[model samples]
Target: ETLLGFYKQYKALSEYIDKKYKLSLNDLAVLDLTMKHCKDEKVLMQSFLKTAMDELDLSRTKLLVSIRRLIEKERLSKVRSSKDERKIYIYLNNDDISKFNALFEDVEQFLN
Candidate 1:
């Protein structure tokens, strides 16, 4: 059995919130670049926005699928413009926007 290490605790941050949100492992990994699709730090809670990935689909077809499923939950959304193509995000509803903001605030408060 593994003993506790600082590294041991890393995924726990993702592990719990996704559990709370009905989010999946694929999208859990997707959380890294989900910010690139947002202009608002309010939208993405960003830090690392410059890392690069390859061939997009090879990157995360599975991850993209998970986000679409999130849209079905009405907890996520898609954004577009005249040629906006696609972006990674959800249009927050009253309860939906409230979901993550409230969840992370409690997390940051106690952890910080």
Candidate 2:
């Protein structure tokens, strides 16, 4: 599947699992967003991205730098393709997949 499509699908699946397994609404939303963004090579809306950064307690510069670092560290990857260079697509590596899975499970069980 295309990256964006995969992201959207995985997000829904994650939310389903979260709810079925019992997770707080906030935790479920955060997990869904994080997995979707980390698993696909798709840019998020600027407004949403900003809000997510704030929610994660990361500064804009830190967030951007973190993205770059993830790419460099092989934990994630991103590309800027739009004319304005504002659209950044990102994806995660297998290692990050495991990490997210762990968190998802914990949050799910916590609220269970």
Candidate 3:
């Protein structure tokens, strides 16, 4: 059920990304998960790619290339996690906030 809910939200978010950036389904999933968890773009990208490859069964090289492309394309905010500087935080830019807000609103509507 939880996975179904995530898929529903992921589908909605994929549409949002398509309208904005024409991102692929894989890219949308990567971005959405990163946005939901990492809170810092580079670190999020790194962490997501790591976990996805290490545990979630993605091709690490492909993910690495995608992350490199994203980093090259966008300038993400740099936040230092209080827990550790080694754990630098990544956040969406103002532009991303708009997309994320839209996704959030859409998901809430689905849940409610």
Candidate whose lDDT is highest:
3
lDDT of 2 by residue, 1-112 (tens): 5899768766766677556544434444544565766565445546445866777765666555545544564444455666767565565556767766776676557445
Off by over 4 Å in 2: 1-33, 45-48, 82-86, 93-112
> Residue-wise lDDT of candidate 3 within 7-66, one digit each (tens)?
987777668656766455565455566665555444544566677676546698876655
> The CA-based lDDT of model 2 is what?
0.58
Superposed by TM-score, candidate 2 places the C-alpha of residue 41 at a distance from the truth, in angstroms, of 5.8
Backbone clashes for every candidate come to: 1, 0, 6
- The TM-score between candidate 3 and the true structure equals 0.47
- Ranked by TM-score, the better of candidates 2 and 3 is 3
- List per-prediction Cα lDDT, in the order shown: 0.47, 0.58, 0.60
Rank order (by lDDT, best first): 3, 2, 1
Each model's TM-score?
0.46, 0.43, 0.47
Q: Is candidate 2 or candidate 3 better by lDDT?
A: 3
TM for candidate 1 is 0.46
The residue pairs found clashing in candidate 3 are 39-90, 40-89, 40-90, 40-91, 41-90, 41-91
Q: Write the per-residue lDDT of candidate 1 for residues 1-112, one digit (tens) a residue.
A: 3655544554665566567776654553444334344324324211112222342333434544665675576655554444544433244445545654565585566345
Better of 1 and 3 by lDDT: 3
